[PDB]
Amino acid sequence: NRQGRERVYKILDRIQFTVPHVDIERARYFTESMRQTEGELLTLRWAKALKNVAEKMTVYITPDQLLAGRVGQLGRYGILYPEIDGDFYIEVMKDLPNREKSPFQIDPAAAAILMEEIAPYWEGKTYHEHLNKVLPAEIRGVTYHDERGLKSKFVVSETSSYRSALQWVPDYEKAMKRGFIDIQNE
Amino acid sequence: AKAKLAGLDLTNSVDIWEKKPFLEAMIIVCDAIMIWAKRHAQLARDTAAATSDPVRKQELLRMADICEHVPAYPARNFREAVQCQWFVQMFSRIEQKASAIISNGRMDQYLYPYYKKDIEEGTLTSEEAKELLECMWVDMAQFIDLYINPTGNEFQEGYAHWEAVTVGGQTPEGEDATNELSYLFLESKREFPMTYPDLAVRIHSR
Numbered sequence A: 001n002r003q004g005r006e007r008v009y010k011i012l013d014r015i016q017f018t019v020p021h022v023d024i025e026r027a028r029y030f031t032e033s034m035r036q037t038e039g040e041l042l043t044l045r046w047a048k049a050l051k052n053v054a055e056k057m058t059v060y061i062t063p064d065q066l067l068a069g070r071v072g073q074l075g076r077y078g079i080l081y082p083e084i085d086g087d088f089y090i091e092v093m094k095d096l097p098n099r100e101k102s103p104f105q106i107d108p109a110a111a112a113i114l115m116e117e118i119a120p121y122w123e124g125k126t127y128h129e130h131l132n133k134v135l136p137a138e139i140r141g142v143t144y145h146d147e148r149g150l151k152s153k154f155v156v157s158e159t160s161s162y163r164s165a166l167q168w169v170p171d172y173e174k175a176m177k178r179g180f181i182d183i184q185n186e
Numbered sequence B: 001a002k003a004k005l006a007g008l009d010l011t012n013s014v015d016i017w018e019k020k021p022f023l024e025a026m027i028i029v030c031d032a033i034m035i036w037a038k039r040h041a042q043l044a045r046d047t048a049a050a051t052s053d054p055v056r057k058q059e060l061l062r063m064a065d066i067c068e069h070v071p072a073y074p075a076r077n078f079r080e081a082v083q084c085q086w087f088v089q090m091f092s093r094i095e096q097k098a099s100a101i102i103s104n105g106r107m108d109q110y111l112y113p114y115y116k117k118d119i120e121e122g123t124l125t126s127e128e129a130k131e132l133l134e135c136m137w138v139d140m141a142q143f144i145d146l147y148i149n150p151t152g153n154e155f156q157e158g159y160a161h162w163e164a165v166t167v168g169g170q171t172p173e174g175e176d177a178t179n180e181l182s183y184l185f186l187e188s189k190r191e192f193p194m195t196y197p198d199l200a201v202r203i204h205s206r
């Protein structure tokens, strides 16, 4: 029932029926900053990294949108958080496009930057590697099937190595009522 | 450490993480120094077998008995007490670079029960005790504080070191703590002049 909805349907028609792409820019510019700020307060490193992303990443207006802003290329896309689970990239990226559940495609140039520049930085540094490393022997059995912790046991499953955090709702109202100049002045 | 570990509640949400890894570390560090000492006992036997001089051979053999007992088990006499001390201070250097090189504590106090007993029972003389302490000094004199960072080098130039040995002072009950060993340390410093050990005396109003 498309009467009066020419704009949204034109946007949605172009992307429905398409395989999502892996966009690497957030992860690239995040990593580029973080590797220079090691040892500083983590949220300070993180803010500097987000500023690096804000300055260097491609900015976008989706064709025909009234809203400005994406965090990755046109089409359906996802982005990367190697701080969580970068130790999986070597095992998973090759199989992403043929994944029975939720396939993704990755462009060859993007994959080259991902595996040659991004993933090597995060070796020995990911949250997943650290958790797997230190988990008490009495707990491993119900947690991971394998010594690298790449396979869950699906008995007592940890869920912190595939996401940064629980769900969250920020205070949007505060942002629109005050603006970030006033928040910064605070 | 093992007993503390058995007393944790390893069914609760926290002990397995907050406390057990520390007690595991303590169990391991106790093995470390004991393993190290045991390898010395065997080195002494092998050295004894390769040594023709009968006297030094017996010396090396008594050394092996000593290193088999201490620091794993309580010292039984002055010679075991000193070699225990020696293992702890040398393994402390392996542990870390404590400023000034690790200090030696109130040697005249904690060695005195061993020294008095062996003296009385005729297993030890004061000349032999003094020789053993002086053996400590000449091997301490071969461990040189190595500062790489120029700041450390210029704040401790000339291999500056202060491996303090404390004699005299007061007991934990606040009476004078002078004993025969206190005097022995001062005699040895006069008789055997040398830049080791850093002999430090506690003074009080009495």
Ligand SMILES: O=S(=O)(O)C[C@@H](O)CO
Pocket (backbone or CB within 6 Å): A165, A166, A167
């Ligand atoms: O509460 S969370 O475990 O972060 C996510 C759940 O709300 C939706 O998947």
